[PDB]
Amino acid sequence: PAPVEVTYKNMRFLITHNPTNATLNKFIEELKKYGVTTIVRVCEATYDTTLVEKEGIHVLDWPFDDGAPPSNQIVDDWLSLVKIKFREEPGCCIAVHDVAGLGRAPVLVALALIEGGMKYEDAVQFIRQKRRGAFNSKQLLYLEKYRPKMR
């Protein structure tokens, strides 16, 4: 596929794919083309994250189960992360990436704009506009039964 930018209320994210080691310089071109300063990975390591940090953007490897919802610890770490980085540098952008960007990563973005005020149906229809077929049943269940906190 290809990366997608999502913006709501000074929040901006880049749902993306897992690159290979040769694609990664054009990748960083695209990461800076949307101004992302940190990237959080949910798939498994198929490359090395020292050059992406040498180009200025920090890498956080938080893997959880493929096709499955995130645990509540990953959720709170994630919300605290968006808070910290978006008041450190507002208008900036933080990237999340699955294998192609069609499950876990969009789920995280989903929780971010659902805690940011946008409703459940409005958020899901906001994401699948931007990339078709984004969520599967096990993740629909979570995003449906998730309780917001106005964080």
């Binding site: 596929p1 493929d66 699955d98 294998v99 499950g103 876990r104 078709r132 077929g133 049943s137």
Partner: protein
């Protein structure tokens, strides 16, 4: 004579999908990126009659570029230049589209673009893992026109 057939096709452009006229992945003629463009390989590519050939890496589902025959313009067989290199010397846009896409819409993308070919992908919600785009086939402008004029 011709006219009522072509008219009927033109009207059916609205209901038929890219999925109905594509040549499925199993029957597409394709070439792997690790091909070595020596004398016999290039000859075999030329003799096929195809002007453009999808290029895959690994499994044929993993379609990475397009080799136009003209792209071999000044390649030396004695040098055995791998195909991926030639792939890197030329830009040929690589469109992807969903099985949903009606034939009139595909036709109008074809009319605009520079690429007359498109990979046909579906999305599957059924999995113990994250959803993924599954390539089903390839649709060309010739498939669409073949479906207008029968």
């Amino acid at each position: 004579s011709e006219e009522l057939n072509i008219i009927q096709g033109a009207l059916e452009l609205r209901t038929k999908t890219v999925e109905d006229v594509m040549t499925p992945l199993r029957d597409c003629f394709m070439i792997t990126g690790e091909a070595i463009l020596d004398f016999n390989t290039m000859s075999e590519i030329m003799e096929s009659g195809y002007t453009r050939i999808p290029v895959f890496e690994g499994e044929r589902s993993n379609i990475v570029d397009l080799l136009f025959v003209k792209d071999l313009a000044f390649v030396d067989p004695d040098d055995c230049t791998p195909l991926k290199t030639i792939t890197k010397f030329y830009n040929h846009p690589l469109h992807f589209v969903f099985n949903d896409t009606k034939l009139d819409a595909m036709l109008e993308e074809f009319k605009k673009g520079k690429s007359h070919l498109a990979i046909v992908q579906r999305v599957n919600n059924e999995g113990e893992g994250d959803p993924f785009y599954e390539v089903l086939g390839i649709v060309t402008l010739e498939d669409v026109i073949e479906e207008i004029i029968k």
